[PDB]
Amino acid sequence: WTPFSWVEKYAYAFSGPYNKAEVALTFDDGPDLEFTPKILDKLKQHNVKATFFLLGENAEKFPNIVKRIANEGHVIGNHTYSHPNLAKVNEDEYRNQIIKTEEILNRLAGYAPKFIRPPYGEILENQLKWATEQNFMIVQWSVDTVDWKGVSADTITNNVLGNSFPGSVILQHSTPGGHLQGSVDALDKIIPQLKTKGARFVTLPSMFQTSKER
Ligand SMILES: O=C(NO)c1ccc(-c2cccc3ccccc23)cc1
Ligand SMILES: [Cl-]
Ligand code: NA
Ligand code: NA
Ligand code: NA
Ligand code: NA
Ligand code: NA
Ligand code: NA
Ligand code: NA
């Protein structure tokens, strides 16, 4: 496990360029029926695009919310199919979780997503090597809202505003059935205060200057 050396050897990163006044909001585990629509609305009221890492099994249940994300200018990412610990699977099951989710998202969004985020941040070097050759790009995160703990919006705001820098990639969740109401309300405080500091919200394709599709 050498996360640092991998950013020089593969398509793999934790944050973006230091010389741009840009940050990136990302959302995991969706789509869902309660939190994804709210996030989309608050992102609409703040003129902000984001990047959604969607589970393949959840895109099947709510195929229109996948389409709503892409139609509103957001970028869709691959978050595997059934959310397993990729460090505990073999190559064929790893490549099965990726390619299966890709075909589901390609059918709904109209493109094969280029960005992969491994659940729990767990991934192995050979898995990373395979995705690099397949023209993927894995992006983790550098600011953790730890919103799955069900924390409040004020707590998430101080946690985000206290650890955000140019190039920060922020992690939030739109998990079906999670305690994420404070994570949604935090967007009303996080987005304006970072704008006060001069930050612009971009998607992962714009931050790393690459296409959204593979
Ligand atoms: O994308 C996720 N789920 O879909 C996800 C789940 C949990 C965490 C997560 C939360 C808190 C601390 C962590 C420390 C190391 C690795 C992951 C951590 C980050 C992301
Ligand atoms: Cl490209
Ligand atoms: Na790592
Ligand atoms: Na980094
Ligand atoms: Na950075
Ligand atoms: Na409903
Ligand atoms: Na192959
Ligand atoms: Na920086
Ligand atoms: Na950062």
Q: At 156, which CATH number?
A: 3.20.20.370
Q: At how many Å resolution was this determined?
A: 2.5
Which entry of 32, 74, 147, 173 is annotated as an active-site residue? 173
Between CA 144 and CA 188 the distance in angstroms is 17
Please say whether the beta carbons of 41 and 174 come within 8 A. Answer: no
Please say whether the beta carbons of 174 and 28 come within 8 A. Answer: yes
Please say whether the beta carbons of 23 and 166 come within 8 A. Answer: yes
Please say whether the beta carbons of 99 and 138 come within 8 A. Answer: no
DSSP 84: -
- The answer on whether 29 is annotated among ligand-binding residues is yes
Sign for the pseudo-dihedral over CA of 55, 40, 203, 73: positive
Q: How many structural domains are present in the chain?
A: 1
Between CA 97 and CA 83 the distance in angstroms is 9
Give CA separation, 122 vs 66, 132, 141, 149, in Å.
25, 16, 12, 19
> What is the DSSP track for 48-83?
---EEEE-HHHHHH-HHHHHHHHHTT-EEEE--SS-
Q: Is 120 in the pocket of ligand 1 (CB under 6 A)?
A: yes
**Mutational pocket test of ligand 1: of 117, 120, 173, the residue with most ligand atoms within 8 Å of the beta carbon:** 120
Between CA 67 and CA 70 the distance in angstroms is 5
Residues paired with 13 in a beta bridge: 139
Q: Give the residue numbers spanning the domain of 66.
A: 1-214
Q: Compute, in angstroms, the gap from residue 67 CA to the centroid of ligand 3.
A: 31
Give CA separation, 203 vs 57, 75, 76, 77, 209, in Å.
24, 7, 10, 11, 10
C-alpha triplet 155, 160, 166: angle, nearest 5°: 170
